[PDB]
């Protein structure tokens, strides 16, 4: 299912890559998902 939780990619987001793990880049707020934006 990959990040299922009945919630797909967060709206108004833009994942990227730090300097693995990856994240949806929560620029809209002020942090970064390090495991799941909503699980």
């Amino acid at each position: 299912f990959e990040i299922p939780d009945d919630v797909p990619l967060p709206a108004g987001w833009e994942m990227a890559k730090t300097s693995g793990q990856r994240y949806f880049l929560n620029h809209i707020d002020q942090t970064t998902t390090w495991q799941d934006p909503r699980k």
Binding site: S19, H27, W34
Partner: peptide
């Protein structure tokens, strides 16, 4: 180690 992503608190 595992550093966080860029764009931190202003």
């Amino acid at each position: 180690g595992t550093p966080p992503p860029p764009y931190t608190v202003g």
